[PDB]
Amino acid sequence: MEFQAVVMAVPKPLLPVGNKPLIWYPLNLLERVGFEEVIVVTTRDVQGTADSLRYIYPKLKTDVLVLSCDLITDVALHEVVDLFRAYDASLAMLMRKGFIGVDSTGKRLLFMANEADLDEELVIKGSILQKHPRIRFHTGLVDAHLYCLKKYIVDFLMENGSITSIRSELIPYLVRKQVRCYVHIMKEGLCSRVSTLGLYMEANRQVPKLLSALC
Amino acid sequence: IGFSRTVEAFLKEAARKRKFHVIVAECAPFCQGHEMAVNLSKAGIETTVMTDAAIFAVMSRVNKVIIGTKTILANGALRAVTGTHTLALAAKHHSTPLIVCAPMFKLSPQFPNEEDSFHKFVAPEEVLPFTEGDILEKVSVHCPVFDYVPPELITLFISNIGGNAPSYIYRLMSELYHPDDHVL
Amino acid sequence: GSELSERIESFVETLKRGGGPRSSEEMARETLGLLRQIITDHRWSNAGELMELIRREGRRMTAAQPSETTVGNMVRRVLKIIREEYGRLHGHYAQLQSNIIEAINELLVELEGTMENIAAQALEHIHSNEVIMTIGFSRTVEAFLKEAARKRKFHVIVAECAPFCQGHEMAVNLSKAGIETTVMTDAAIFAVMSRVNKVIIGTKTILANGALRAVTGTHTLALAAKHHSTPLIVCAPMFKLSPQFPNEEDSFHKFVAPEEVLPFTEGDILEKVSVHCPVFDYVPPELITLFISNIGGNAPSYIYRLMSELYHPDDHVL
Amino acid sequence: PPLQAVLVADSFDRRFFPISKDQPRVLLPLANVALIDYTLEFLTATGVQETFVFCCWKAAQIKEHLLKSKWCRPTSLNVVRIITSELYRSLGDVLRDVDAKALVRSDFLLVYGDVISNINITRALEEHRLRRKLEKNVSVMTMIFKESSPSHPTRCHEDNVVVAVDSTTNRVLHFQKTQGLRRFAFPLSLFQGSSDGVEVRYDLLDCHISICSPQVAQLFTDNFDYQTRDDFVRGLLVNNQIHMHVTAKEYGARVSNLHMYSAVCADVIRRWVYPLTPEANFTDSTTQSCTHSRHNIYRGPEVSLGHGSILEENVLLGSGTVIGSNCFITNSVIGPGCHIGDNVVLDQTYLWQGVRVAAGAQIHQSLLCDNAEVKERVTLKPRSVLTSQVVVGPNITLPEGSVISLHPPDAEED
Amino acid sequence: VPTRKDYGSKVSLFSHLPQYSRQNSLTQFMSIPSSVIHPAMVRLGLQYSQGLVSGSNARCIALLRALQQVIQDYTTPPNEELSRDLVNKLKPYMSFLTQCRPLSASMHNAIKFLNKEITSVGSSKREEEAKSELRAAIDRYVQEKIVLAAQAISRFAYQKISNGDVILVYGCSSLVSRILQEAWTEGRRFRVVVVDSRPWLEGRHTLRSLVHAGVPASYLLIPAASYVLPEVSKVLLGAHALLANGSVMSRVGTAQLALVARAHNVPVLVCCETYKFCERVQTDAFVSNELDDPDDLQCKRGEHVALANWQNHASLRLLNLVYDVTPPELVDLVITELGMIPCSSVPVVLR
Amino acid sequence: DYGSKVSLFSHLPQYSRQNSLTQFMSIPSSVIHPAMVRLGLQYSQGLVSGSNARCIALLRALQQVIQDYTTPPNEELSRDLVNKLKPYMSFLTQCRPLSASMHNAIKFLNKEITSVGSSKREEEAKSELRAAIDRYVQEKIVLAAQAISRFAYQKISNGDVILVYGCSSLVSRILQEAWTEGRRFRVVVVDSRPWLEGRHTLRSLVHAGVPASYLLIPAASYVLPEVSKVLLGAHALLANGSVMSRVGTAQLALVARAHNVPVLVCCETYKFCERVQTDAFVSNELDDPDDLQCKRGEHVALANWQNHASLRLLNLVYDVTPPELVDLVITELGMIPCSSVPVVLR
């Protein structure tokens, strides 16, 4: 029992993506490798993220692996889980190319600003640059919204319930600071999240090539 | 060198999983190395046969030496067949390991005394035949079967209790025999 | 001859700045050509003026780079040629120039032929299923090895050099010919120097006592060979043979920037730590087995005679 | 087209002040050898065929030192030309004057008279020309930077810079200093237009070596209030493109202040600027020959070393310098014609020509210029600089950072 | 659990030693929520494969902490004896860890000690008592074999180091670093000379440690050891294992340095504890060694890599050795927590 | 070739004694001279195995060939003879590999033939060649042993225990001449298989009256402690100072050095070759492998050794000794060190 699976779905998960349920692709991603248990937070009719996560705090008792309501990707979970295992990282995330301040080696996360917060320019501290004099900045990549998180991070989220939508509130605070955050960029994967109509149609068009290998 | 059942088993136990080249130096008085080479080649080990004179000129491409002995002395030395001293000298000159496959019963508490009864002298018929002529009356022929091998030329001792160094045989002796029964 | 002075200055600068040609054969050929040009385009009546001028020019060229023990040898050879010619003609002040040029050309052609003269002696020392190892990268040893790989088969092991990993090129060149070569570091010499049957290496200079000033790392190889009693052969032409002894010499090695040993991006520790990067080293004669020269093999104990034959005792100081 | 460079042998900035009053900055003996000699040797070794030496402050001494030097000989392949003028006030004025005279033709290098480097520029210059020939009249400058550590002693805060360039094609998008500032600001235009491969670099040492183009001088004439190079780059980046070339296996640094002076000296003595070392004698001079021995100890002719003294680390003794008995010198540079006493400890001290130190003196991390003198029982602290021709009485203990000069207002007078 | 796959062409002489590449991992074909292997064991194997934990004692410490975690998280099954439960459960974990990276002598000794202790567990005591006893014995061992032994070795070696001496170290050994630090702290005034070797370049660790301590350390490569030895007076070396025949199975570049030192008349000292003594023998580095990732041998010289594509040549082999053996006649004495003993006394301590 | 050779000795020819090369030849030999034919047959059958005996027989056969050699018209003889003698040497080598003595002798003969000008008559040239061969033999073989006999007489003392190995035409002569001068010593004769040629020296010494002993080489370490000197003979002296002799010489010198016994070597100046060698692997000679067969006990163990495809039979002849084990060398010029061979070659 190294990791526990959790996927929030707060319809969207019932969209027939390729004549199959949209929530079936995330669950299939959490399959074929152990994972005899997975926590879903869909509505009662389905047969914030921080709030829904803390609502089931006493249930989880080990490292958590949070996914998105719908996430179609043909990546190997080990690729992202190795960063959490080897380096004993506190945060491990996955994303694909189209702030982020990934370092030279391409794994350590240094900067996580957003365009809405910054005033006009990009401010950078002197110490973080003293330690790492090279900061590779990415702007066009897309966020798949899946993270491998430790347990003490969940405890910290619980002891203060003033955090909502960890994607934009917790990850920047974690990167801002020992904590260890890492990222994995494929540059050749699918990594499609169904949020708008364009991505929905792209996923509908890409389904056959994935289903040919899945089934 | 020579013919030793323990060394033969040690060699043929590795041939079933490894491939090596075994060189066998015969014994001039009693050419018993031929039997060992034949028994080894019977199992496909790529053996070789040669005389005792070709032990140094050929021992430049060799890497390891594994031989037996008649008995192991107290200071680490041993009593081996004739010609083993030259083999050990060549091994030490080329800095090659010299493994000695000998069981525990071959350990003698006696030390290297001046060793008059050390070598076994046999009839000179093997060295020089009786049909030579009239020169046998004024020619002294000696045929020592065994020889003394110092410990400095040895590198390891493989026994039924694990490999050890020559500098630790005294403890094995102390554990085996009582110091009062050394002279018997 | 201002053009001659310009050529001399350019040669001295390229030798003191970053060296001349990359290989030693081209260096010796260029030095001999420059000496021939100096002998041709210059005025003199007696041989003493010519020989002292050549002495001064060679002294300048050596002061430009003392570690390049290839130009002083050519200067001493030209001086010995001049002295032999003067002794033959006097034992003279009107036709001594042309004959010196002829002798220099005779020396040049054999300088070039040295490579084949050395490579032709590969089958005399290499046998089938042999295990030979080398260190560094040398054209002479490369030819000596790849010339016998057609009819003979053996295993080669190349040890790279830590400061400048030049053995990779040699390993690749040998693998392109199908010799079954292996690459390793210079820190695993003694670890593998127990299954080796022979060693062949190339040097940069041969001292008077039969010693070698080769790249850094060959002294340990020679020590390991002498410990394991493995014959170590050195293939070097005659122009790599200098009339100087190991001691009685300062600036024996060449010290280059520590960038190759310890990079500049370490930090503040570079102010305390002292780093040294020697390019060459010294190998005593007692660890050498044979010398493959253009005139055949020779033991390290017969180098003094070649010295007395090639150079003049009065021209050792230069 | 023969490669030509422009040498500004005068830094209108005055950081060595008080020292720059009696004797120019570019002729201060670093390792018994002037800085302009290092710069000229670098230019002559990199392939430069012609140089234009501009001098305003104390130009007579510069020229009359150069005319004896080996670069002005008829046998030198890098013909140098001294242009002296009293109007120059900044580098921008020098470039304006070049444009007025039409001296330069092609890609020229812009370097100061106090740059020490062994970098080869053939590679970077090819990159520059090829880049300009794929985009006609687009690329205008190429700044050479040496990647280092932000911890290195050579990286002073006064010259420390931070860049944000594109990794696809090396190109400067933002350039600013970090003198007295803790969090850096980078505008959003960088990500606004292009530069998918954009990254911030803080591990770079500004060698002040730039492969310029005639268009640089043209733009310098257009904008009258360009007083230096840094402002040229800032004013061009607000608006032509400026690129870089990074080196990792070569050395390069500019002597801008006193702290920077003692940093290159240790490196030069420690052979970090090979082939440029004291052992090489790259000036063809007779009074600078030495012999390199173990531990990077350099000894010249007529060293007169006394019995008992111990040379422990990278020291450089001059020709004619006299050492006493039972001394201890380490990491110290001694000039020619110096003369030491007895029981004299020198630790990271730079003694120029004509110095005499009496017995019982302990000097640590301080610099003694020409004709300096100290009496017995005198102890000098770190950064305790003495200028020309001062004499310090006996039994005096100078505080740290003390500066003594014979000019009244320069510092604490004699 | 699947078997790891080799990488590249091995040498004819080392055809019996496995050779893997750190680019590929064995967890690619295993579950993320590990079912057969414990999660801590998976993390430890990943750290070993990626080269994060490459220390002689650090690997053993990490293994012991992982074993403590495993014993804490595990519960014995019904109607099953406890003494064999842990042994049967650890049997595959050692297999996995060996597949990730060949275990060292210290790890083998620690595993043997833990198996001994587990077999020594009684049949009447409950689960909590035995688990607590094992968890306490593990750290008791760590204390009485690593830190206390290191303190004793440093106390014994302090008297050998004197003022004005020049010590020559090699590689990265925490014991030698601690010895030098304590010697410099106790008032000894000396200077060290660090010798490094490619491709690991781990001597810089001890270099920066000594610089942090304030010792006038020096740095150079192993091929130039013959140039600095004429001025060296002592050679301190670390040992990864000491066999029954009195041979040091330390880093590959240690036997060469010892040979050059003996040729230059420099007494060499070896620091090692009593928990690295194994009841096995090895006469040469060929019969038993480890082959690391060969892709680490290639380097960038100039602007092109000569070994960029070494697998294209069908007659090109890459040998990347790790350890090697040195004969007993090269080591003068071996410093241990039981007093200074010669190299001919390893069996005496093993007895 | 006959039989399967060794992997490390696969670059050398392994002939046989039963397989004769005269089968595919005319009884009156047309292409080859009858004298050279019988000489090669003797070499192959082992009738002449002595280092100096082989050279003497070769030179006498060459004299016989020259005596009945007719120079064709339309060409000079100074070159025709050299061009004709080459196939004879090739056939001799095919019969049995040549030795250093034979090589030097044929080289000297070729040089002498080339020194003959076409200005001279045929009969005069043949007579001069015969006289030259005769005097060269007398100088380098006959007179080259009388000076070595009186030089080694100084190093022989009363009560000495000299140890010899194999068979040598010079060692036996040295000992027999030193015994008659007044010295009273005893010799230890060492022999090895399968040639067992030391019995020749044993008999030659017994017939002279010198107390002699006989033992096999494996027991050399047992008798060396009582030995005072080791006098050995070799076939060639390489240019690198090394010595080329019988296979049982290098290890003998090694054991002598281990027992602290001074080793000596006696060789003629004409055996001073110009090549070099480092081991007995690059240039050796493999004789018939069936010589190792021995009637030990009731039957032979290597009677059908070829049935075992994995079994090889090595029968090396020569070996190379390093200069690190040779102390003194005796020649007609005088007592010289082991590292002075090139000086004599000069």
Short mmCIF file of C-alpha atoms in Angstrom, two decimals, chain C:
data_model
loop_
_atom_site.label_atom_id
_atom_site.label_comp_id
_atom_site.label_asym_id
_atom_site.label_seq_id
_atom_site.Cartn_x
_atom_site.Cartn_y
_atom_site.Cartn_z
CA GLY C 1 66.35 37.62 -45.81
CA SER C 2 63.44 39.32 -44.07
CA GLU C 3 61.06 36.63 -45.33
CA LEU C 4 63.26 34.03 -43.62
CA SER C 5 63.09 36.01 -40.37
CA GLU C 6 59.31 36.23 -40.72
CA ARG C 7 59.01 32.47 -41.22
CA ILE C 8 61.28 31.87 -38.22
CA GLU C 9 59.24 34.21 -36.03
CA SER C 10 55.97 32.59 -37.13
CA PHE C 11 57.38 29.14 -36.33
CA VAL C 12 58.64 30.27 -32.92
CA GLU C 13 55.29 31.88 -32.10
CA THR C 14 53.17 28.90 -33.16
CA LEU C 15 55.52 26.63 -31.20
CA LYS C 16 55.40 28.75 -28.03
CA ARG C 17 51.70 29.61 -28.41
CA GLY C 18 50.02 26.29 -29.18
CA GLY C 19 52.64 24.17 -30.89
CA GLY C 20 53.22 23.44 -34.55
CA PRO C 21 51.73 20.43 -36.35
CA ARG C 22 49.80 17.88 -34.32
CA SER C 23 51.99 14.86 -35.11
CA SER C 24 55.70 14.59 -34.33
CA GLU C 25 56.68 13.50 -37.85
CA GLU C 26 55.30 16.70 -39.37
CA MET C 27 56.98 18.73 -36.62
CA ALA C 28 60.38 17.19 -37.37
CA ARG C 29 59.89 17.61 -41.12
CA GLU C 30 58.95 21.28 -40.72
CA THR C 31 61.92 21.91 -38.44
CA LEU C 32 64.30 20.28 -40.92
CA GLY C 33 62.79 22.27 -43.78
CA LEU C 34 63.20 25.51 -41.83
CA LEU C 35 66.82 24.60 -41.09
CA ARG C 36 67.41 23.86 -44.78
CA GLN C 37 65.89 27.23 -45.71
CA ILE C 38 68.11 28.98 -43.16
CA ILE C 39 71.16 27.22 -44.60
CA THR C 40 70.15 28.20 -48.14
CA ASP C 41 69.14 31.86 -47.73
CA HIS C 42 72.02 33.20 -45.65
CA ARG C 43 75.57 34.44 -46.18
CA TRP C 44 78.67 32.89 -44.61
CA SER C 45 82.27 32.07 -45.53
CA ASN C 46 83.43 29.55 -42.91
CA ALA C 47 81.49 26.66 -41.42
CA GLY C 48 81.96 28.08 -37.92
CA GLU C 49 79.65 31.01 -38.63
CA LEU C 50 76.99 28.71 -40.09
CA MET C 51 77.17 26.26 -37.19
CA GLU C 52 77.06 28.97 -34.52
CA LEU C 53 74.13 30.63 -36.30
CA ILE C 54 72.29 27.30 -36.34
CA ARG C 55 73.17 26.85 -32.66
CA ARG C 56 71.68 30.24 -31.82
CA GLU C 57 68.53 29.55 -33.85
CA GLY C 58 68.06 26.17 -32.18
CA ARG C 59 68.62 27.71 -28.76
CA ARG C 60 65.90 30.26 -29.53
CA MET C 61 63.52 27.58 -30.80
CA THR C 62 64.12 25.46 -27.69
CA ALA C 63 63.64 28.41 -25.33
CA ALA C 64 60.33 29.00 -27.13
CA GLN C 65 59.15 25.57 -25.92
CA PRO C 66 61.54 23.36 -23.92
CA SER C 67 59.08 20.45 -23.63
CA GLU C 68 59.01 19.98 -27.43
CA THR C 69 61.97 17.60 -27.69
CA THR C 70 61.72 17.25 -31.46
CA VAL C 71 63.29 20.44 -32.82
CA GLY C 72 66.50 20.33 -30.79
CA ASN C 73 67.10 16.83 -32.13
CA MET C 74 66.84 18.09 -35.71
CA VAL C 75 69.14 21.03 -34.92
CA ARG C 76 71.74 18.68 -33.43
CA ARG C 77 71.41 16.34 -36.41
CA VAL C 78 72.02 19.21 -38.84
CA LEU C 79 75.00 20.33 -36.77
CA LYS C 80 76.45 16.81 -36.82
CA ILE C 81 75.91 16.64 -40.59
CA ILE C 82 77.77 19.93 -41.04
CA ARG C 83 80.62 18.78 -38.79
CA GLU C 84 80.96 15.42 -40.55
CA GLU C 85 81.00 17.14 -43.94
CA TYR C 86 83.62 19.68 -42.84
CA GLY C 87 85.79 16.90 -41.42
CA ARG C 88 85.45 14.85 -44.60
CA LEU C 89 86.36 17.79 -46.84
CA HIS C 90 89.17 19.11 -44.61
CA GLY C 91 90.44 15.87 -43.05
CA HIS C 92 85.97 23.38 -48.49
CA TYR C 93 84.86 27.01 -48.13
CA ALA C 94 83.38 27.17 -51.65
CA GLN C 95 81.08 24.15 -52.20
CA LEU C 96 80.00 23.07 -48.70
CA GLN C 97 76.41 24.29 -49.13
CA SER C 98 75.05 21.96 -51.82
CA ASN C 99 76.31 18.79 -50.14
CA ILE C 100 74.69 19.81 -46.84
CA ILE C 101 71.40 20.21 -48.74
CA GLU C 102 71.81 16.75 -50.28
CA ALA C 103 72.44 15.23 -46.85
CA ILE C 104 69.38 17.02 -45.47
CA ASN C 105 67.21 15.64 -48.28
CA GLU C 106 68.56 12.13 -47.65
CA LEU C 107 67.59 12.60 -44.00
CA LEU C 108 64.12 13.90 -44.95
CA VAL C 109 63.14 10.94 -47.11
CA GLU C 110 64.14 8.46 -44.40
CA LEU C 111 62.32 10.60 -41.83
CA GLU C 112 59.17 9.95 -43.84
CA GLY C 113 59.98 6.27 -44.38
CA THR C 114 60.40 5.70 -40.63
CA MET C 115 56.69 4.86 -40.32
CA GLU C 116 56.86 1.91 -42.71
CA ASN C 117 60.27 0.90 -41.34
CA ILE C 118 58.65 0.57 -37.90
CA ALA C 119 55.37 -1.02 -39.02
CA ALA C 120 57.21 -3.72 -40.98
CA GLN C 121 58.43 -5.30 -37.70
CA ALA C 122 54.96 -6.14 -36.35
CA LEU C 123 54.92 -9.89 -37.05
CA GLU C 124 58.24 -10.50 -35.25
CA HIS C 125 56.80 -9.74 -31.80
CA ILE C 126 53.02 -10.31 -32.12
CA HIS C 127 51.64 -13.86 -32.07
CA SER C 128 48.18 -15.38 -32.34
CA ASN C 129 45.63 -15.02 -29.54
CA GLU C 130 47.81 -12.44 -27.79
CA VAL C 131 46.56 -9.91 -25.23
CA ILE C 132 48.22 -6.51 -25.65
CA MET C 133 47.22 -3.20 -24.06
CA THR C 134 48.18 0.40 -24.79
CA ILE C 135 47.67 3.86 -23.31
CA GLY C 136 47.13 7.19 -25.03
CA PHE C 137 47.09 7.72 -28.78
CA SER C 138 50.13 7.42 -31.06
CA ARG C 139 50.28 7.10 -34.84
CA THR C 140 53.35 4.84 -34.71
CA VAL C 141 51.70 2.37 -32.33
CA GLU C 142 48.43 2.59 -34.28
CA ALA C 143 50.24 1.52 -37.45
CA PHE C 144 52.27 -1.12 -35.61
CA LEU C 145 49.02 -2.64 -34.34
CA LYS C 146 46.79 -2.36 -37.42
CA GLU C 147 49.53 -3.63 -39.76
CA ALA C 148 49.54 -7.12 -38.21
CA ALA C 149 45.77 -7.36 -37.67
CA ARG C 150 45.28 -8.72 -41.20
CA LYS C 151 47.13 -12.02 -40.76
CA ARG C 152 47.30 -12.17 -36.94
CA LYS C 153 44.47 -11.95 -34.42
CA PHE C 154 44.77 -10.54 -30.90
CA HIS C 155 42.93 -8.54 -28.24
CA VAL C 156 43.65 -4.84 -27.64
CA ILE C 157 42.87 -2.74 -24.57
CA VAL C 158 43.20 1.06 -24.68
CA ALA C 159 43.45 3.08 -21.46
CA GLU C 160 42.30 6.68 -21.79
CA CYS C 161 44.20 9.59 -20.26
CA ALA C 162 42.45 11.49 -17.47
CA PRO C 163 43.33 15.12 -18.40
CA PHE C 164 42.91 14.71 -22.18
CA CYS C 165 40.99 11.54 -23.08
CA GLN C 166 42.87 10.85 -26.30
CA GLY C 167 42.64 7.05 -26.18
CA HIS C 168 39.05 7.15 -27.42
CA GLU C 169 40.17 8.10 -30.93
CA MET C 170 42.70 5.25 -30.95
CA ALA C 171 40.10 2.76 -29.71
CA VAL C 172 37.65 3.87 -32.40
CA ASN C 173 40.31 3.68 -35.12
CA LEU C 174 41.27 0.16 -34.03
CA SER C 175 37.64 -0.97 -33.82
CA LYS C 176 37.06 0.30 -37.36
CA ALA C 177 39.66 -2.26 -38.50
CA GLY C 178 38.16 -5.18 -36.57
CA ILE C 179 40.76 -5.95 -33.90
CA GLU C 180 38.30 -6.48 -31.01
CA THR C 181 39.54 -3.55 -28.94
CA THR C 182 38.34 -2.59 -25.47
CA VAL C 183 38.21 0.83 -23.79
CA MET C 184 38.84 1.46 -20.10
CA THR C 185 39.98 4.14 -17.67
CA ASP C 186 43.54 4.78 -16.52
CA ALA C 187 42.52 3.85 -12.96
CA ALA C 188 41.97 0.15 -13.78
CA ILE C 189 45.45 -0.64 -15.12
CA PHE C 190 46.70 -2.78 -12.23
CA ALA C 191 43.24 -4.34 -11.92
CA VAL C 192 43.46 -5.75 -15.46
CA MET C 193 47.25 -6.10 -15.67
CA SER C 194 47.13 -9.78 -14.73
CA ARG C 195 45.69 -11.40 -17.88
CA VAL C 196 47.81 -9.23 -20.20
CA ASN C 197 50.69 -10.93 -22.02
CA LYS C 198 52.44 -7.89 -23.52
CA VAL C 199 52.35 -4.09 -23.60
CA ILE C 200 53.08 -1.73 -26.50
CA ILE C 201 53.14 2.06 -26.04
CA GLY C 202 54.44 5.17 -27.76
CA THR C 203 56.55 7.93 -26.25
CA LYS C 204 57.31 11.60 -26.87
CA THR C 205 61.06 11.60 -26.13
CA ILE C 206 63.79 9.06 -25.36
CA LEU C 207 66.42 10.25 -22.89
CA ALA C 208 70.11 9.37 -23.00
CA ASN C 209 69.94 6.63 -20.34
CA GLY C 210 67.15 4.78 -22.15
CA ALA C 211 64.33 6.56 -20.32
CA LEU C 212 61.02 7.79 -21.73
CA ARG C 213 59.27 11.13 -21.29
CA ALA C 214 55.83 9.95 -22.36
CA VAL C 215 52.34 11.10 -21.42
CA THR C 216 51.33 11.11 -17.77
CA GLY C 217 50.24 7.64 -16.67
CA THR C 218 52.85 5.41 -18.36
CA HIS C 219 55.16 5.23 -15.33
CA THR C 220 52.47 3.41 -13.35
CA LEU C 221 51.90 1.12 -16.34
CA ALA C 222 55.62 0.29 -16.47
CA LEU C 223 55.70 -0.33 -12.71
CA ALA C 224 52.73 -2.70 -12.96
CA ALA C 225 54.38 -4.47 -15.90
CA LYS C 226 57.63 -4.95 -13.99
CA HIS C 227 55.61 -6.20 -11.02
CA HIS C 228 53.74 -8.73 -13.18
CA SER C 229 56.79 -9.43 -15.40
CA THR C 230 55.18 -8.47 -18.71
CA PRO C 231 57.39 -7.24 -21.58
CA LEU C 232 56.74 -3.55 -22.29
CA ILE C 233 57.71 -2.44 -25.80
CA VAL C 234 58.19 1.16 -26.97
CA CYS C 235 57.84 2.04 -30.66
CA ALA C 236 59.47 5.40 -31.37
CA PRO C 237 61.50 6.64 -34.37
CA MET C 238 65.07 7.91 -34.02
CA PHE C 239 64.10 11.61 -34.08
CA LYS C 240 62.37 11.11 -30.70
CA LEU C 241 65.79 10.40 -29.13
CA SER C 242 67.45 13.27 -27.25
CA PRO C 243 70.97 13.43 -25.72
CA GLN C 244 69.83 14.45 -22.23
CA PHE C 245 69.47 12.60 -18.93
CA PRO C 246 66.42 12.49 -16.62
CA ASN C 247 67.97 14.69 -13.96
CA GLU C 248 70.26 17.60 -14.84
CA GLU C 249 67.07 19.11 -16.29
CA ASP C 250 64.44 21.51 -14.95
CA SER C 251 61.01 22.01 -16.49
CA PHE C 252 60.92 18.31 -17.33
CA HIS C 253 57.13 18.05 -17.37
CA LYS C 254 54.57 20.43 -18.88
CA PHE C 255 51.96 22.03 -16.62
CA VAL C 256 48.77 23.20 -18.32
CA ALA C 257 45.79 25.12 -16.98
CA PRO C 258 43.96 23.22 -14.19
CA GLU C 259 40.70 23.53 -16.16
CA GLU C 260 41.09 19.96 -17.41
CA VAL C 261 41.60 18.56 -13.90
CA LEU C 262 39.22 20.78 -11.90
CA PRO C 263 36.69 22.92 -13.81
CA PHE C 264 36.26 26.64 -13.23
CA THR C 265 32.61 26.18 -12.17
CA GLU C 266 33.41 24.58 -8.80
CA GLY C 267 33.00 27.63 -6.58
CA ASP C 268 35.03 29.33 -3.87
CA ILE C 269 37.06 26.22 -2.99
CA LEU C 270 39.29 27.02 -5.99
CA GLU C 271 40.96 29.77 -3.94
CA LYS C 272 42.22 27.30 -1.31
CA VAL C 273 42.75 24.10 -3.29
CA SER C 274 46.00 23.89 -5.27
CA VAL C 275 45.66 21.96 -8.53
CA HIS C 276 48.45 20.71 -10.80
CA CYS C 277 48.08 19.15 -14.27
CA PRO C 278 51.24 17.41 -15.51
CA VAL C 279 51.17 16.36 -19.15
CA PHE C 280 54.26 14.11 -19.22
CA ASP C 281 56.13 11.94 -16.73
CA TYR C 282 59.41 10.06 -16.28
CA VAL C 283 59.89 6.32 -16.78
CA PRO C 284 63.20 4.77 -15.63
CA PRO C 285 65.10 2.45 -18.00
CA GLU C 286 64.80 -0.56 -15.68
CA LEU C 287 61.09 -0.94 -16.55
CA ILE C 288 61.61 -1.01 -20.35
CA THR C 289 61.96 -4.29 -22.25
CA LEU C 290 62.64 -3.45 -25.90
CA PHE C 291 62.97 -0.50 -28.28
CA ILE C 292 61.52 -0.94 -31.78
CA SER C 293 63.45 1.54 -33.94
CA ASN C 294 63.93 2.02 -37.67
CA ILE C 295 67.07 -0.16 -37.48
CA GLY C 296 65.29 -3.01 -35.67
CA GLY C 297 64.79 -3.85 -32.04
CA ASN C 298 67.25 -2.81 -29.36
CA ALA C 299 67.52 -3.21 -25.61
CA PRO C 300 67.41 -0.14 -23.34
CA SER C 301 71.07 -0.80 -22.46
CA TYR C 302 72.30 0.08 -25.98
CA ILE C 303 71.04 3.65 -26.29
CA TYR C 304 74.34 5.40 -25.46
CA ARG C 305 75.91 4.09 -28.68
CA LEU C 306 73.05 5.41 -30.82
CA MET C 307 73.53 8.73 -29.03
CA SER C 308 77.26 8.85 -29.79
CA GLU C 309 76.50 7.90 -33.41
CA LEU C 310 73.70 10.37 -34.12
CA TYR C 311 74.72 13.47 -32.15
CA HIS C 312 78.06 15.07 -31.25
CA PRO C 313 79.08 15.24 -27.56
CA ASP C 314 79.89 18.96 -27.85
CA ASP C 315 76.41 19.65 -29.29
CA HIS C 316 74.52 18.23 -26.30
CA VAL C 317 74.41 21.58 -24.49
CA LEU C 318 73.51 23.47 -27.68
#
